[PDB]
Symmetry: C6
Subunit: 200 residues, 6 copies
């Protein structure tokens, strides 16, 4: 299959996240990596995929223009990181089709504005999504969690140690590429566990 | 009246689902098949028709264009699969009229975005629809049910065996067309039983 | 007054419903027939008028165009059927005035999309409508009733026999124009009774 | 002052409604009549004015065009009826300014669509309005009344006799100008009393 | 600092309200007067400022154009009345900046439509507003309070004497400009006390 | 790291707040200063960053144009003030990226209109915001708190002394730039504490 041969990281409960970052381009086939994510979601994930999307902004002095520059998919064992070109290449069809799948649910934190931007700027549609803060808010009856970011939401639901995460993110500008990737992988693993808890 | 002479499939409760997949051309008359679906819905389904819709995306490097390419209708005994052409032939107004029928209720999983895409891109309108996860959530007082995909919703409400489905969907990239049909038919049958349960 | 000289039908409680279908033309005066409907609604219907609208779709291979092709008005004792020309003739402003009336409440099943299409395509405005399912769902406290079509809703609220209706609709394509008229007459009658039971 | 010298009518509790119908035109000064309405609203009406608006529709074969053709203002002792020209004349400024007053509350029945049409087609804005069915729905906790027209709403709240009203409106097409006016005056008086009850 | 040397008025609780009405010209500096209002709001009003806005409508025979012509600001001790020119002079950005202040909360009666008109026609924006009837309704559990005008709301919550107000407003067409100011000042004082009551 | 070498201020609980105001230019690097804010937010602020935005309006005699002229970021220990040029310089995409961050939650008072103006005029998007009043209103069950400005909200939740703040703001026009900076610093500090008390 497709190997997630990038730098891995150990979480605070000893479990491991395998990573792969791909600079997608006209000739890159990401179907095997997406295939892996889905497989892991079906077997070991209760059909969830935690995701985040990252924007680049240009031409702010004129009329600011937002473009999706990368997306993260995290399952139980994997964290896939796709850096997207500008503009998209047609093979990214696969990504559009993936995001629209109902085989799974795309779990994210504060994603209201993202879903809008994805539609407006790229026509990317996510038919099966869950803004997990809203679900936590209802299920736990504690209204604050609707408004927390990834870390603080995870802290109110899981109370795991987040020392390493907090460390990397407090000095974000100085963090190496490997460090940035690690934080992303932790955030992924954290939200995966917030969902695991809310689904049972 | 009309013959569902494609590959049939056996569900985990030993009931048989008959199938038919059609490539709608300008000279194809789908009216006999919709009649069979309607007739089965009326006598054996409490006037529900399970549906899903499938999209192809084109031209994402410039301005993506979504387009409806297949629809699936399921009742207790039948699964109908229509593959649609680009563009539509004029005789597909039969399908438009069918979707707008108040004789039945079109039941689907996570269809909010679909309904929107059907209007914007085709002016297909569904006057009688039910997004089943919403109803289930409200009736069973378990909020998470609203944000689940087909399989995971079906699991929380029926607890039937889904090994076969999971097996097919986990390795979707390498599944035969016959396998994919089976998955679709199973999902149809599952959603139907979900509805059967919430309607009494 | 005007005469409902068309085919009458007996309901399952042995009460008679008179009908009239009209092919509205520029020379046709529908005012006596609306008058009769209105009159019956005031004396015998608690000022309810049950309605349904029917659409024709054209030009689906291109840019679909929806047009109101007929409307049905049902009271306790009458069912009026109006087939409408394309385009409307200018005397159809009598229908516009009627729909906008506050003398009555127009009762329909699953009419959200209908009201919208009536605005976009014709500027038909209904100032006093009731989506009967939404009201029943609230009153009876059975949330599913909001999403049922005409027959299935009537069943959960009335439990009258509906074998005749089911029989005609299950083989709709093979139903004579007289049979189809009867089915419409019955749905009207059924919905009138659902309203009757909820207004008291 | 301005005299309400038109045909008056006795209600079923013996009280009297004085009327005036005015065909407003470029040279008509309606300020004294509006002044009267406001006076009566301040003294004897708890600062309410019941209103209704009447539309004419044109050019239905083409693109239907709605224009406000008349408006009714009812207080405790008065029913003012203004027939508006096409187009408005500039002196109707006074009416725009009146409708925007916060000295009072404009009470009406099913006015959601009207407020939209008034804004879209004339830029008429009503800053202090009350759709009285919604208020009755809350206060009385009986959800049906949100959807009733003028008469049936009045019947559920007041249980006065409405024989004469029902009579006129069942044979609306045959009713003399005086008859039509009378119904309007009763509806006014009825809603005034529905409000009187809900305000104490 | 700035002198409110217009006609003062005595409220029914024997407290004195000082007034000032200004015709804002391009060389008028309203900043001293807004400062006084702010200062009084800060020390004696719990940072509330009562406001109303007044509209002139033009050109209704063709396409009506609404335009803001006066605003009133009230605190416990002061009532400021600004008559605005057509068009605005550039120095009215002071007023724009004042309305956008988060130092205070702009309290008004039935202001939903006003806020909309202020944006559409002037891009005046009020970041900190309170539609007081909404708050009152929610806090006192009496739904009707939301739909009341200034006087009638003030009556249901304070039960002060309003003979003077009622006297002036009932014969508004023949009230001196001094009388009209008094009415405005009184209304300001009433709404302020309404807020004083709901804020503790 | 970067130095907050501007005028520091003591709060009413004897804790020090360091400040820095910057006149952002094309050559100015704000990244160290945002880094410091972020760092303090992670270690000492439960990942909250308190913010306020300030607008300049132009061309009011014509068609008003709103432009973001400065923004304030407050944590437990720092207050950062950024005055922004017109137009923005292209390196301000660092501010865009920062506002869009999910590492933190941006906490503000009455920010509905702000978020909207930030979108219409600049495409500034805040993916993780909290309107603190709306949260407090829900938690404390005191509905008025949703509509209060910064000081009055802080008063109902904290009851700290605010004489210094009130003193500066009551004579705002006569306040030195140093005084105005202090007021902004305090509001930040106050809101931080309101958040602190609601997150625990």
């Amino acid at each position: 299959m497709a190997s997630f041969d990038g730098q891995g990281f150990m979480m605070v409960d000893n479990s491991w996240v395998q990573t792969k970052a791909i600079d997608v381009e006209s000739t890159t086939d990401i179907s095997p990596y997406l295939s892996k994510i889905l497989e892991d979601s079906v077997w070991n994930g209760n059909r969830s995929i935690v995701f985040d999307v990252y924007w680049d902004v240009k031409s702010v002095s004129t009329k600011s223009e937002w473009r999706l520059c990368s997306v993260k998919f995290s399952t139980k064992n994997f964290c896939l990181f796709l850096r997207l070109p500008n503009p998209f290449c047609d093979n990214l069809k696969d990504l559009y089709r993936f995001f629209a799948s109902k085989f799974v649910t795309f779990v994210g934190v504060q994603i209201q504005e993202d879903l809008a931007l994805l539609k407006e700027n790229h026509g990317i549609v996510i038919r099966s999504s869950l803004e997990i803060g809203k679900l936590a808010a209802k299920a736990r009856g504690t209204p604050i969690v609707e408004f927390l970011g990834t870390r603080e939401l995870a802290h109110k639901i899981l109370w795991y140690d987040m020392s390493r995460l907090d460390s990397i993110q407090s000095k974000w500008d100085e963090a190496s590429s490997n460090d940035r990737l690690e934080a992303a992988a932790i955030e992924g693993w954290l939200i995966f566990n917030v969902y695991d808890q809310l689904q049972q």
